[PDB]
Amino acid sequence: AKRRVIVPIHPTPNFPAHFIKSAFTTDPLKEKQKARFSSGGEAMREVQ
């Protein structure tokens, strides 16, 4: 099928773990889906 392959990015001094699992995906049927949202200190207190 000529299935595309993606090699994992490991944590880096500028590229911490959560940045990687949130901004990078090794399964390329999940590319080009859409934006995900998350909340930080105050917007989290509002939503939760």
Place this chain on the structure above:
Amino acid sequence: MFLIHFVHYKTILQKYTFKFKHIFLSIDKYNSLFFNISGILIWLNIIHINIILIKYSFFILINNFEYLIILIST
């Protein structure tokens, strides 16, 4: 021969002071301006947005090195 017994005076006075800085006092470091981050956008394979504080953003950073990242009101 010995004619005498005496008590050993010495002048130990330090009256001058010479202190020289060692080299590493003047070496560089990396310093940064620091503001409160209101939000973050990351994109590499898939875009992800985190919003800490919603306000009108007065400053915006863009950084391309590994992943595209945009630090809002940073």
